[PDB]
UniProtKB/TrEMBL annotation, chain D:
Name listed for the protein in its UniProt record: Small nucleolar rnp gar1-like protein
Biological source species: Pyrococcus furiosus (strain ATCC 43587 / DSM 3638 / JCM 8422 / Vc1)
Span of the entire protein shown here: 8 to 81 of 104
Ranges in a coiled coil: none
GO terms under biological process: pseudouridine synthesis; ribosome biogenesis
RNA sequence: GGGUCCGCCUUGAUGCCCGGGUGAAAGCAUGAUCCCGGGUAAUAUGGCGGACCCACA
């Protein structure tokens, strides 16, 4: 996969930097999900830390 | 830099971690890639975990820091997944690497594990 | 640019003295979390890999739901906007199947073409285009916006009529350019009224917000994960009905003219319409038996043939 | 014979491509101005008012027809 | 007899997906390959019953 997106201005691009505002882009597709979600508890510890829960 | 990076890693210490992967690769045994690294932590085989700072999506390696802390295994951050991949002896990038047997870099892993514990607190 | 879902319709007033009784009904704003889920739609960012139907099955299993459905099939390798209607709302996806779609696509050319020629040829594929040669079936391309060209790679945004196959569109552009082309990557950025905004949610965030509700008692994150079923209906022409007609429709009556309070203009006979309360609750989906002018001017007759009822019978009292 | 138009190019996937102002049918026979058989219509695409036509060639060297005007034999 | 809501009744040339194990020339450690376990195949139409209604607001 190589379609990327600027997180702040929402510009779709193939570049690592945004051609509009000039910041680091992120890959457009969401990560693989597993219904088994073997490490979901550890992801939640990180997520609770970030969100302040 | 991304939220899964728990602490700030000095430029010198990141090089020492990449050196530790390079040496242990051909003198000992290492696990490369996020699935292999995670299994190594889960099995209690990893002595040191090395995680890239440029991983996107973050969710790929986000589970590792709290997994390492639960299984009592030290971890370190490196700037580039491409650079970490080359150190693991593969032509593509690596999001995370685990050291199973340090070999000649045994003292180097000791130095890292001691210094990351001070950054953790 | 603009889809037929974006162009505002005039609201025609039939009864200026139409008033709604606060005693009855549940507008989206005052629905408890459980009721919110029962009449909810997830604006999901589908991962590439699984089919749209597999993803829906994962959602049902994890959130412990009896029913769910998706609003317009995304192919396995394709990521992006996938509305997943839940439980009592499941069938609202029927309003989403014929809706206009938007995509961001990556076309890889099989030969070297100048940038000016790429843009010119792609501009020609806007409008009514042939999707099947005779021995005539057409489809509308509302816009093509070339974002960037990196050698043989062409990244573009495209708004299309429902049933437009982007893989096919790209193959045809390659033939018109001579060198040939294929679709190497696709992402849906819009499915009807659903788009890439704050409400778009991954499976990871969905399940985690569910866990924050079940374990931590925090409902705010999981509430935001789910949109009201009324959102799935934002792109449709609407007919707003008086309180006294609501229970009749929910009990199986078709909508007659004396029950209409307000309505959108431009409704043709046979159009799919949403029947709404004056509190903007979704009552039912229906097929218009009359035009907007007919509904506004006439005093009698069936205005809408009711096809699918979503509102429970006991929300409004029997007033017929 | 009904005029299709100029051959824009020979697509490497194996089709002569013509821009025209009407919609031919699948399997229509394609000739030049001298009624010499060229090929067969295998796809019609693009704008309804000004479509592209993909012609499967049935001559040995289809490349020579680039820039030449083709017709549907009727 | 009808409408709405719900329940029930049918088929599928190894794939693909997800996971456990393994962990390698455009592909590819954000997972090749193979071994194993599971999931998902058309989100109809027709038919039978149950409940609520027969509604111009
Ligand atoms: N002439 C062609 N015929 C068939 N397939 C092609 C042709 N050119 C490119 N492709 C396809 O496009 C894909 C893109 O890979 P690749 O980058 O090697 O192509 P490319 O044309 O060399 O692109 P670039 O020149 O930008 O590197 C290939 O895997 C190939 O299947
Ligand atoms: Zn930007």
């Amino acid at each position: 996969f190589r379609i990327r997106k600027c997180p702040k201005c929402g510009r779709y691009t193939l570049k690592e930097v945004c051609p509009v505002c000039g910041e680091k882009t992120k890959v457009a597709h969401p990560p693989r999900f597993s219904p088994e979600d073997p490490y979901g508890e550890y992801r939640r510890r990180w997520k609770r830390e970030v969100l302040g829960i | 830099k991304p939220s899964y990076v728990k602490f700030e890693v000095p430029k010198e210490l990141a090089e020492k971690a990449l050196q530790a992967v390079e040496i242990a690769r051909d003198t000992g045994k290492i696990r490369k890639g996020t699935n292999e690294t995670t299994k190594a932590v889960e099995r209690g085989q990893a002595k040191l975990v090395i995680i890239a700072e440029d991983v996107d999506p973050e969710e790929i390696v986000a589970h590792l820091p709290p997994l390492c802390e639960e299984k009592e295994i030290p971890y370190i951050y490196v700037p580039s997944k491409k650079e970490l991949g080359a150190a693991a002896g593969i032509e593509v990038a690596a999001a995370s690497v685990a050291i199973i047997e340090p070999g000649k870099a045994r003292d180097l892993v000791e130095e890292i594990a001691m210094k990351v514990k001070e950054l953790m607190k | 640019r603009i889809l037929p879902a974006d162009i505002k319709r005039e609201v025609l007033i039939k009864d200026e003295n139409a008033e709604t009784n606060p005693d009855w009904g549940f507008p989206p704003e005052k629905r408890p979390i459980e009721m919110h889920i029962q009449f909810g739609v997830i604006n999901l960012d589908k991962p590439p890999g699984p089919t749209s139907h597999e993803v829906v099955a994962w959602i049902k299993k994890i959130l412990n739901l009896e029913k769910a459905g998706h609003g317009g099939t995304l192919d396995p390798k394709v990521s992006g906007v996938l509305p997943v209607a839940l439980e009592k709302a499941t069938r609202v996806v029927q309003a989403l199947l014929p809706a206009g779609k938007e995509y961001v696509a990556l076309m890889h050319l099989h030969g070297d073409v100048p940038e000016d020629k790429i843009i010119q040829v792609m501009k020609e594929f806007e409008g009514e285009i042939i999707q099947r040669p005779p021995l005539l079936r057409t489809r509308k391309v509302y816009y093509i916006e070339v974002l960037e060209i990196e050698g043989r790679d062409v990244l573009f945004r495209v708004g299309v009529e429902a049933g437009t196959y982007i893989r096919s569109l790209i193959h045809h552009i390659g033939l018109a350019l001579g060198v040939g082309a294929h679709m190497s990557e696709l992402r849906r950025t819009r499915s009807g009224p659903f788009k890439e905004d704050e409400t778009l949610i991954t499976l990871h965030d969905l399940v985690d917000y569910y866990y924050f509700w079940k374990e931590d008692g925090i409902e705010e994150y999981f509430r935001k994960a789910i949109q009201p079923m009324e959102k799935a209906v934002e792109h449709l022409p609407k007919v707003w009905i008086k309180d006294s007609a609501v229970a009749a429709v929910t009990h199986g009556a078709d909508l007659a003219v004396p029950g209409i309070a307000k309505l959108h203009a431009g409704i043709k006979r046979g159009d799919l319409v949403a029947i709404m309360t004056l509190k903007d609750e979704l009552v039912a989906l229906g097929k218009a038996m009359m035009t907007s002018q007919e509904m506004l001017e006439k005093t009698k007759g069936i205005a809408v043939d009711v096809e699918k009822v979503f509102m429970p019978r006991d929300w409004y009292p029997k007033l017929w | 014979m009904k005029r299709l138009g100029k051959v824009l190019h020979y697509a490497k996937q194996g089709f002569l491509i013509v821009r025209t102002n009407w919609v031919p049918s699948l399997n229509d026979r394609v000739v030049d101005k001298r009624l010499q058989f060229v090929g067969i219509v295998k796809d019609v695409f693009g704008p309804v008012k000004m479509p592209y036509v993909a012609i499967k060639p049935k001559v040995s060297n289809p490349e020579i027809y680039v820039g030449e005007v083709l017709y549907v034999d009727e």
